[PDB]
Amino acid sequence: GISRDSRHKRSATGAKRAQFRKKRKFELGRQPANTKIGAKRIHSVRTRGGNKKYRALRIETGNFSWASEGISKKTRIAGVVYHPSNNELVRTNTLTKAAIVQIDATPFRQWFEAHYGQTLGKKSKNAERKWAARAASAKIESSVESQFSAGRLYACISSRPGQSGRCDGYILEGEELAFYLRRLTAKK
Amino acid sequence: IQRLVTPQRLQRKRHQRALKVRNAQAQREAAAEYAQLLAKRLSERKAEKAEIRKRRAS
Amino acid sequence: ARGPKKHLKRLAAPHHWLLDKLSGCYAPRPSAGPHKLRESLPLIVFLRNRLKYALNGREVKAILMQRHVKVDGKVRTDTTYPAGFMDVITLDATNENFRLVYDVKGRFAVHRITDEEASYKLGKVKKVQLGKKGVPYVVTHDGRTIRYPDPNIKVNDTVKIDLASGKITDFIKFDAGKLVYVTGGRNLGRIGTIVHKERHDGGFDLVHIKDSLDNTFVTRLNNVFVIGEQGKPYISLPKGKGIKLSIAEERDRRRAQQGL
Amino acid sequence: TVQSERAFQKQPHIFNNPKVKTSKRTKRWYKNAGLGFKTPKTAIEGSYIDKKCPFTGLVSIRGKILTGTVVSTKMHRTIVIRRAYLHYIPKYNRYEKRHKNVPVHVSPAFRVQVGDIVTVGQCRPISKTVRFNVVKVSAA
RNA sequence: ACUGCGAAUGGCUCAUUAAAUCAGUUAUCGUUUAUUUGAUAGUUCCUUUACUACAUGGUAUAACUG
RNA sequence: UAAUUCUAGAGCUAAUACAUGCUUAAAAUCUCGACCCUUUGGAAGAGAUGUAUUUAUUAGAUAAAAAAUCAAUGUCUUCGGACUCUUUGAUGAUUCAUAAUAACUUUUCGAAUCGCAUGGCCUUGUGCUGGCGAUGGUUCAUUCAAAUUUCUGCCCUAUCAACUUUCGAUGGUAGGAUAGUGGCCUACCAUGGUUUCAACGGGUAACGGGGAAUAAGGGUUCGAUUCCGGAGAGGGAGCCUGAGAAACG
Known part of the structure; x- marks a missing residue:
């Protein structure tokens, strides 16, 4: 199969090497799993030792994370816009690490009103007792709420789905978002 | 006859139940005494390092 | 294979x-x-x-x-x-x-x-670490782990183990002038005391050991097993007591002892 | 300049909170290498991002220590060191000269032109043919 | 006969292989590990004891008869 | 059925096989918040917290002294609020061990097993407790290991002087794959790397070392073969079961 030996390449000189042994099981590769979007299909493979890995063949949800507030909720994912390795994964919508997708913004907005009581865009006495407490921490960055009219955020993936099975990540913020948005609307 | 109730099977789940209660009781016993020793060892350490400051005052 | x-x-x-x-x-x-x-x-x-x-x-x-x-x-x-x-x-x-x-x-x-004497056992200290749920343990040279030690124990010290319950009575530190057994190498089995120990960062540290007849030698750090303070071991030593005798000295000491 | 590559570049797991405000530039992270080596000035307050640097990246230094003269700087973030010795032939009672080239890695904290003489230490495999990177420098 | 463990050790030959093997020497802060030896587990009926067993739930097949 | 360690249909019953599934101390701390009528409020009730899986974000201190200050408070209230208050492992070196906060999961483990003995307590109920040890179990250490890797070292040959890079050759960035590092493979980019101190190619009736024969001293010639290391099972390639094999009874 796919082997990871260095005994088939050339030296730093250029001298062609020689066939030394047959191919050994403890240097093997497997097949690349491409991860589409759809209903949950996850298959399990058996590794060195008695361990276990979960290959994800297609999934549709995830578990994403708001950094600056420090809350991580479970949402759905929609589609990939940008991939820095080759752009044949954006035209097929696979799922790797460092892929930039769009999520639906609904449970973060529904959390935001519960935590503060202030809208996005445009009655027990316990509530305003503590809503008055969280007063100074109310406003956020302009350029991130400015997509809550459409419910499509920008988020990158930080979990390897072919190994761990899952697909999680984190929301783009303004320093990093300034880079990618200049990259997003100019390279097309 | 396999898989019937029997006095022989009866005390085995008694002894198994009696094990981990009598076992794990002793841990929080022995953990407190370890923190007891660490409690007093800090207490002199607040005092004994202040005596350098008594000498640093002199 | x-x-x-x-x-x-x-x-x-x-x-x-x-x-x-x-x-x-x-x-x-x-x-x-x-x-x-x-x-x-x-x-x-x-x-x-x-x-x-x-x-x-x-x-x-x-x-x-x-x-x-x-x-x-x-x-x-x-x-x-x-x-x-x-x-x-x-x-x-x-x-x-x-x-x-x-x-x-x-x-x-x-x-x-x-x-x-058959109720206890020494053992040196190979590592000391912080285990799961925040408790510490200590690993001896034969592999016993023991949770909850004193904080003043460090590595390369020596513990005393009670073989009945598997517990610690007391311990000995590691510094200059102690009684030391040597458990590996060339000067293997000799007993002496510590002169001093120099250290090489990222390498193998060397101790200098003096005998009782005052002749010195050098080994690596890990072949050194602390026994007690000077003149007072904690175990029953064999005959000869770790004194290296030259081959000249042990022909005639066998000759004069040959009177049967 | 420091953002030329096609993906965003950062010392990972180093978070900037935009809600707070502090007049520092960015929370840079930096370590001490060991063995009595001194982290240079241009790494703690510099602005490059490099994955493979001893004072900033996630590599360790342990193993050997070598020394040699630099003979080619035509790659991007690697150089080539020449080392020279002698070799004894017992029948003829004499010596003969030999040499070996080693390639190492250069953090952008250092500025190395040809002809100098560096000291280098060993890290885990970096490329196909690379296992050292520079840790000190002295000129020509 | 099912289940568990072992069959990856041992024994034999020297065809390939010229910086490869292999020797003395380092490194793992770069990884997997049956076994052995020593530690290690009150929280898990929807529950804090409300229907629904813990004095203990359910099928399927081997040898065998024809 | 001529046949081989070939097997079909019908009928029974077990498990440490296969598939499920209960039990248990008290404490604390969080969020929600019925009410309450109020100042500077305090509250019933509710739920959440083992370990393992995946991601994000904090703690993981330490080089030498004293004020002015913005308020808040522990406290004698001196109703001024001045003060009469801190712990922190190891390494040459870490984003190390280890702990917390939000969560997440074709939800992992947390004894529905077996032999011996047979006693103590009683309201005497087959009531309640209770000895020695076999086998299984999650994670950290440990032992037998394994996989890669640093420095220097090989016989004859110029009637072999230039070799490697489409088809990865030398480096950079991001993914894939693996037990894991790495052009190991895939994308976009740079134009490198080896050489008269002999690269690259050709021969070997060449497995390498510990060692063996001869010996004034220096040396010349051997090592298929009792020990350690590698490779192979008619010649090439592929994979199943398993902690471990690209295995050839």
């Missing part, structure tokens, strides 16, 4: 066991256990090549199955169980108690001890 190996040939067996090179073709191979392979001694080299009690392999298994032989207050029947340094071998139908400790020319010595 493909898996582990399971035979030991006769000439590849460790030299200080003194198997004679014509009786067979393989040697006993020691099981996986507390002590390392080339630093230990199975229970068949003890009970038929040292004490001469048994005359076969079939006689040793007949001794072990009668549940006589213990190590450290625990019964063993593994016919190649690996007993190593500082282990206590308590037979019962003779009321003898042994302790494994080094000779001077580099061998494992037969040593009889009392019935009261």
